[PDB]
């Protein structure tokens, strides 16, 4: 698979529930959900090396990793973490995260390329899974 693309979100489910697990207060959850329903993921994939640029209207962040090599990024609720990405299958990867400081719910994310041209992302905090779907623009 080639995950490279300028991905635009078309669906987002269970994001508020995810943020609730992470302890984000309700007022702040609603505006975070609002930012998510119009946010973008740009991916450049070169073999097992990935360059990810995630952005909203006012914020952008770059995440660069190689499958199987630990890197540093941040959790959904904005805390620094050490991350490790592995393939689960031909078209799906999974990232496990460990907080650099403190404790919290266990968090992870996945990316999957479907046969029909979609990118499915998930983000997990303990038992709650958020699922987001993107198409190329
Ligand atoms: C797909 C791979 C990675 C590392 C994605 C990381 C995504 C984020 C840090 C996204 C954060 C945001 C969300 C979930 C929705 C809108 C607001 C943010 C850009 C802060």
UniProtKB/Swiss-Prot annotation:
UniProt cross-link Glycyl lysine isopeptide (Lys-Gly) (interchain with G-Cter in SUMO), position: 101
One Gene Ontology MF term: retinoic acid binding
Pfam families assigned to the protein according to its UniProt record, in alphabetical order: Lipocalin
Family classification: Belongs to the calycin superfamily. Fatty-acid binding protein (FABP) family.
Major place of residence: cytoplasm
Domain of life according to the entry: Eukaryota
Induction (UniProt): By retinoic acid.
Binding sites annotated in the UniProt record for all-trans-retinoate: 132-134
Residues spanned by motif Nuclear localization signal: 20-30
Annotated consequence of substituting residue 29 to A: Loss of ligand-induced nuclear import
Protein name, as recorded: Cellular retinoic acid-binding protein 2
Compartment annotation: Cytoplasm; Endoplasmic reticulum; Nucleus
Comment text on domains: Forms a beta-barrel structure that accommodates hydrophobic ligands in its interior.
Subunit structure: Interacts with RXR and RARA. Interacts with importin alpha.
Naturally occurring in which organism (per UniProt): Homo sapiens (Human)
Function, in words: Transports retinoic acid to the nucleus. Regulates the access of retinoic acid to the nuclear retinoic acid receptors.
Gene: CRABP2
Keyword terms: Cytoplasm, Endoplasmic reticulum, Isopeptide bond, Nucleus, Retinol-binding, Transport, Ubl conjugation, Vitamin A
GO-annotated biological processes: embryonic forelimb morphogenesis; epidermis development; fatty acid transport; positive regulation of collateral sprouting; regulation of DNA-templated transcription; retinoic acid metabolic process; signal transduction
Post-translational modification: Sumoylated in response to retinoic acid binding, sumoylation is critical for dissociation from ER and subsequent nuclear translocation.
GO cellular component terms given for this protein: cytoplasm; cytosol; endoplasmic reticulum; extracellular exosome; nucleoplasm; nucleus
